[PDB]
Design a protein around this ligand. Structure first.
Ligand SMILES: [Zn+2]
Lengths: 131, 347, 52, 154, 194, 134, 104
RNA sequence: AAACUUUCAACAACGGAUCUCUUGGUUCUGGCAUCGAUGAAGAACGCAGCGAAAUGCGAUAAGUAAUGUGAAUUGCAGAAUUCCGU
RNA sequence: GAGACCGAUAGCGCACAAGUAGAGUGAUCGAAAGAUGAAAAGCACUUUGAAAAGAGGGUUAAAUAGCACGUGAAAUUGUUGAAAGGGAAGCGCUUGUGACCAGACUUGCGCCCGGCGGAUCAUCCGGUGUUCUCACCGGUGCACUCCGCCGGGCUCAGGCCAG
């Protein structure tokens, strides 16, 4: 038994990103959400068949907020000292090795997390196995 | 402009570009007339064309190869083995160090076992590698995800008991074959011999190759090309030991391992001998062109095998590093310091 | 140029702030909360002899 | 995983490039599409006939209504013209790749044009703008297939 | 002044504070029972404190800090060896953290629990890794990979692979390596060779 | 740190002065350490290089290569050494540039001004050691 | 931060500590907040001298227009204020617990 | 069925954004007081083997005298010009 | 001499040929334009052919850094592959099909029997440091105790989806 702790089921209220209006048509508008402000904008008045707005009712359950599908919360780790902070929380958190960590330092982190029983999200990036 | 950089002598960028454009128009015009006057004079007197060609010849990294200008062979010395015997007339170190590969008579029908990396997912790539070598079977390393984690040392003991000759492990990266570990199990009482790990870089299956074909069960003919060093002679004999010694020369299947500058290019073709088509040129040989006796017939080729490029990284005494236990446990270990100069070819 | 670069602070508030910083320097938790590797000195005010 | 279609071997291939060619990009694109996937000798006769005003080049994408001759019955396109400079630049590029194939030792009578591609060159800065082009092309031998042996039972 | 020390650490700044976006804060102090920045488990704000740490020789020690020696951080913690017997080691915490806050008693037992299972987990995966003999090693560096990708391209052109195969195959037919009446070739082709 | 007001800690003024220097003060910049034997005999650490100096390269890809100076190129801050050369495409061998800080001087080219340089450094080094000692 | 007495120690100590990275020197008559609280964070490590501790009473007496401020709280340990015999003797019984059981 | 058009991906173009750099600018502070009829500031004409949309100089013309340093100049030609020496 | 300034569409108009190039009869107006590489080692030689261009081959750690030169975005364009369409289609909700990609609980603890070895075991000896009762070494041994390791036996707990 090495897994996450007993958590209530993760329910995502909406799995699709809120896309900015008319971002599909104009390349200058990024898809990042901007609230419409024209008084005759059909998205703003919320007619049917249009894009929905983000709202606090979409907010995820506070027990399962920030939880990965396995049940863990991601923890950004830069060296071996950061993994040891997860010694008491090896069932709630998972080690996410930062993107600017070298090859050798990753193997030191990956070895340490195995000894501590801490899940690593990216354990096969700059490494390989030699027999 | 060959000895001076216009960037480090003219600070204004735009003035430098026009002077270089004027340089390109001048030199390209000058080279055209100089080569055209040479072509005019070559037509009258063709002897000077023979003199120009033999004196001015293009450079080659192969012809600038650096050998260890010394004696001795120790599986780490870059030296032409064949030129050493020719100098001696005017490899004992390999046979003593590796009695099993370089013995008198190999086992007649080698039995080969191919397995994958542990909890691997490259089953279709490993089975095609198993079809490369005749009399080879594929067994997955782990049955389930949560199954027993058999070691390479164990499987080498298991397959030697059953009667296999070699054990091949294809190690994966990015769900693609990346390393080939070749283990020699041998027979009777001698221990499992040397382990040769390689790197599979440009893997392409036969299905990806346009105009390919199937392979028949005929034993192929082995072509081990351009192996000269003591290390290369071991890599050549190791690939020799996997294949049957007597080829069934009716399937017309050829498996080649060509060593160009420590890159072992692997192919598998099938051929037919045919008369040359009238617009086709005769097959030339190097230094002795217009290959005699064979004049006017050409050997066609159709690929039937995987594309891959191998490079030798480590050779060990036993099975892996953990399995080679003496003080000569690592025989030759590739490091990037050896490829520091482009004319140092290890094998 | 005539942006307000310098700030007038009352002298009483400056001396209050200096008195608090001196008092915080006599507290051993506040030394290591400030990043000082202070685990070897044998007294946290650390008065040395003037003759040395 | 998936594996892309690997490249046909370089020693069975022949390459030629043309960069910054003072020739119209819209015309050369239409001329290169006419001869894509043809034999080498088929293309050199066609491009020479375009030079001699005998056979016309159909206009499909960058098509302008200029001529409606019966020569378009062999293409099915009702718009036709005679690109002379585009034929001349493409002829010298095809002859270059034929010389490259003979240096590499290829069969002169069996090259096909599997790859032709026309890009745009930087505009010549003079209110009027010229439109030069880059052209690259690859020739290969026709795929040769050999016979299989009869499989042996054992 | 333990409440005042907490007000500076919590609201203003602590050098041992790691802040994540996941909703919990972490304490980087090596003398913390739980790596969290709450009031009950701050080594700084709590003048009387306990923790459990592991020496690289494998010995688990109980570190106790008292207020009466807080002015000298050199003589701050007292190190007390814990037994290898687990139920006996739990009793030393109960005996020696007597009359302490229940949180510190509880978190010292749990840190004792985690450290003992890690040692068992260490010895299990060390035995399994010594069995397989596989070791994680760094992959090829970007510059070396760029070098072998470039020098393989030049080796592939210099090989002239399908020409070399044809050259070597025609060499063997000439030299009689295929034997008389070969299954390789066509009999109207051999009569050309003589 | 710096004290005197005439001294500047400007990276801009330092980089301008280094790369726009006259050849007289390029000479002082273009200076090399002396060997262990030469240090214990002349009591001098570093002198500028001249053409006749036998030298040894101790940094770079041409490490442990010994030779005589062939040229002191002050415009590109380069010395040239005998038999430290590379081939061009044409085959012509060209000198390879070593900075003066990458070499150690083995044998000096001695003339009257050079002994005066070596005396003045020894006089100052002896003076301050005596002033520090007593 | 080394704090010294220029009247009894001299300024020769300033030159010895001047090259050592990090360490700073300040006389006891001219204490600096930018050095006592670097970055606005309190708790500087200070290496006092014995002559400076004697002067510390005097330099803060000689400051005209200022006296050492009186705190608005005499006992800053709040646990002593609340968990005392005098406070806890007078309190009402606790109306509940820290966690309340869900009724319905 | 071709073609044509659309979307996506790989590769190849066009273009010069982004990141990084800086012998440049901007602003502040400090020491000091010096153009010209003994012809200034400015404007030309010339002086180097190949030289400008540079710089230096003035028929002694990329400079001479004098002092100091102490072995170069350098993009290529080219100097029996100089090395215990005005 | 400096800076909580700007960083090549910025900062003086000018980081570079900048009051230049260019315009106007004239007074005047007045730009654009930085970055190869550590070092030119700035692509020898063969072969196309009329060119600011290729194919080989070479230098270099790298030439997809080749004086169009650090990185090299988007608009826009070509080739290859998949799919669709005929004044359609584009966005929202919901499946389906195909292609590509990913890969679920990281999968363990506890008892009993035998052997081996270390200890925090021994009212064992000696030494060191200390907050002065706590730690750490060195040498002894296995009567007791406790840990490991190896070889057997047994039990339990395990993530998700259905019924
Ligand atoms: Zn804290």
């Amino acid at each position: 038994m090495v897994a996450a702790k007993k958590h209530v089921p993760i329910v995502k209220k909406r799995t699709k990103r809120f896309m900015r209006h008319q971002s599909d048509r104009f390349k200058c508008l990024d898809s990042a959400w901007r609230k419409p402000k024209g008084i005759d904008n059909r998205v703003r008045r919320r007619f049917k068949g249009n894009l929905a707005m983000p709202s606090i009712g979409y907010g995820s359950n506070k027990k399962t907020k920030h939880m990965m599908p396995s049940g863990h919360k991601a923890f950004l780790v830069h060296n071996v000292k950061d993994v040891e902070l997860l010694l008491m929380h090896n069932r709630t958190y998972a080690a996410e090795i930062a993107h600017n960590v070298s090859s050798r330092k990753r193997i030191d982190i990956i070895t340490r997390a195995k000894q501590l029983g801490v899940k690593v999200t990216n354990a096969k990036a700059k490494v390989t196995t030699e027999v | 402009l060959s000895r001076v950089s216009l960037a480090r002598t003219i600070g204004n960028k735009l003035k430098r570009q026009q002077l270089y454009i004027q340089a390109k128009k001048a030199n390209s015009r000058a080279k055209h007339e100089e080569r055209h006057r040479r072509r005019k004079e070559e037509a009258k007197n063709p002897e000077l064309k023979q003199k120009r060609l033999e004196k001015n010849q293009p450079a080659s990294i192969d012809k600038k190869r650096i050998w260890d200008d010394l004696d001795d062979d120790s599986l780490g010395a870059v030296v032409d083995v064949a030129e050493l015997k020719r100098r001696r007339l005017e490899p004992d170190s390999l046979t003593s160090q590796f009695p099993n590969l370089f013995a008198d008579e190999p086992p007649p029908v080698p039995k080969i076992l191919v397995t994958t990396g542990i909890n691997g997912t490259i089953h279709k790539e490993a089975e095609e590698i198993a079809s490369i070598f005749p009399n080879a079977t594929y067994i997955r390393r782990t049955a389930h995800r949560y199954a027993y984690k058999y070691s390479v040392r164990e499987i080498a003991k298991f397959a030697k008991n059953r009667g296999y000759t070699a054990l091949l492990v294809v190690q994966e990266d990015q769900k693609r074959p990346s390393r080939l570990v070749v283990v020699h199990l041998n027979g009777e009482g001698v221990p499992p011999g040397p382990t040769l790990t390689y790197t599979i870089r440009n893997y392409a299956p036969g299905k990806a190759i346009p105009g390919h074909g199937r392979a028949t069960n005929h034993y192929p003919e082995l072509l081990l090309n351009n192996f000269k060093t003591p290390l290369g002679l071991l890599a050549a004999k190791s690939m020799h030991i996997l294949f049957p010694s007597k080829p069934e020369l009716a399937g017309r299947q050829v498996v080649t391992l060509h060593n160009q500058r420590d890159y072992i290019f692997f192919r598998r073709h099938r051929y037919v001998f045919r008369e040359a088509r009238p617009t086709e040129k005769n097959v030339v040989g190097a230094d002795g062109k217009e290959m005699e006796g064979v004049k006017g017939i050409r050997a066609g080729l159709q690929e039937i095998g995987p594309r891959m490029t191998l490079k030798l990284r480590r050779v060990d005494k036993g099975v892996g590093r953990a399995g080679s236990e003496g003080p000569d446990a690592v025989k030759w270990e590739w490091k990037a310091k050896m490829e520091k100069k482009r004319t140092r070819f290890n094998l | 140029i005539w942006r307000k670069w310098h700030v007038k602070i009352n002298q009483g508030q400056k001396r209050f702030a200096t008195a608090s910083a001196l008092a915080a320097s006599a507290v051993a938790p506040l030394l290591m909360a400030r990043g000082h590797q202070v685990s070897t000195v044998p007294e946290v005010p650390l008065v040395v002899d003037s003759a040395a | 995983v998936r594996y892309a279609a690997t490249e046909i071997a370089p020693t069975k291939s022949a390459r030629a490039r043309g960069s910054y060619l003072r020739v119209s990009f819209k015309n050369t694109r239409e001329t290169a599409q006419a001869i894509n996937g043809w034999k080498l000798q088929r293309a050199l006769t066609f491009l020479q006939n375009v030079i001699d005003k005998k056979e016309a080049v159909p206009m499909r994408r960058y098509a302008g209504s200029t001529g409606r001759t019966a020569q378009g019955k062999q293409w099915g396109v009702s718009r036709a013209r005679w690109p002379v400079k585009s034929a001349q630049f493409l002829i010298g590029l095809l002859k270059n790749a034929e010389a490259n194939a003979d240096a590499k030792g290829l069969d002169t009578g069996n090259l096909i044009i599997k790859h032709i591609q026309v890009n745009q060159a930087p505009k010549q800065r003079r209110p009027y703008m010229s439109n030069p082009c880059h052209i690259e092309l690859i020739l290969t031998e026709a795929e040769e297939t050999v016979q299989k042996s009869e499989a042996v039972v054992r | 002044s333990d409440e005042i020390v907490w007000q500076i650490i919590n609201q203003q700044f602590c050098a041992f504070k790691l802040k994540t976006t996941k909703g919990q804060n972490f304490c980087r102090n090596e003398y913390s029972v739980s790596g969290l920045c709450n009031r009950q488990s701050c080594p700084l704000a709590n003048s009387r404190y306990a923790t459990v740490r592991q020496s690289p020789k494998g010995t688990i020690y109980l570190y106790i800090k008292t207020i009466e020696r807080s002015h000298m951080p050199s003589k701050w913690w007292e190190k007390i060896k814990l037994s290898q017997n687990y139920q006996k080691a739990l009793e030393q915490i109960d005996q020696r953290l007597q009359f302490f806050p229940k949180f510190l008693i509880h978190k010292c037992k749990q840190r004792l629990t985690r450290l003992v299972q890690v040692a068992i987990r260490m010895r299990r995966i060390a035995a399994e890794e010594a069995r397989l003999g596989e070791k994680l090693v760094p992959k090829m560096a970007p510059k070396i990979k760029k070098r072998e990708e470039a020098r393989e391209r030049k080796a592939l052109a210099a090989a002239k692979l399908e020409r070399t195969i044809e050259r070597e195959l025609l060499d063997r037919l000439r030299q009689g390596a295929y034997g008389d009446q070969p299954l390789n070739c066509n009999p109207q082709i051999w009569k050309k060779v003589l | 740190m710096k004290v005197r007001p005439t001294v500047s800690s400007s990276r801009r003024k330092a980089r301008k002065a280094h790369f726009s220097a006259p050849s007289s003060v390029r000479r002082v910049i273009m200076s090399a350490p002396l060997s262990k034997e030469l240090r214990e005999k002349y009591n001098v650490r570093s002198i500028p290089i001249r053409k006749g100096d036998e030298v040894q390269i101790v940094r770079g890809a041409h490490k442990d290569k010994e030779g005589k100076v062939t040229s002191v190129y002050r415009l590109k801050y380069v010395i040239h050494v005998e038999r430290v050369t590379r081939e061009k495409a044409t085959g012509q061998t060209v000198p390879i540039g070593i900075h003066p800080s990458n070499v150690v001087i083995t044998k000096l080219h001695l003339d009257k001004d050079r002994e005066n340089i070596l005396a003045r450094i020894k006089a100052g080094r002896e003076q301050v050691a005596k002033a520090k000692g007593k | 931060l080394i704090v010294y007495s220029p009247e009894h120690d001299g300024k020769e100590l300033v030159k010895g500590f001047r090259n050592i990275p990090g360490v700073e020197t300040c006389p006891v008559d001219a204490l600096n907040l930018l050095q006592l609280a670097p970055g606005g964070h309190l708790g500087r490590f200070i290496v006092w001298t014995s002559a400076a501790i004697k002067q510390l009473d005097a330099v803060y007496e000689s400051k005209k227009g200022f006296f050492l401020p009186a705190n608005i709280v005499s006992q800053a340990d709040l646990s002593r204020l609340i968990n005392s015999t005098e406070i806890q003797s007078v309190l009402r019984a606790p109306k509940g617990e820290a966690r309340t059981k869900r009724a319905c």
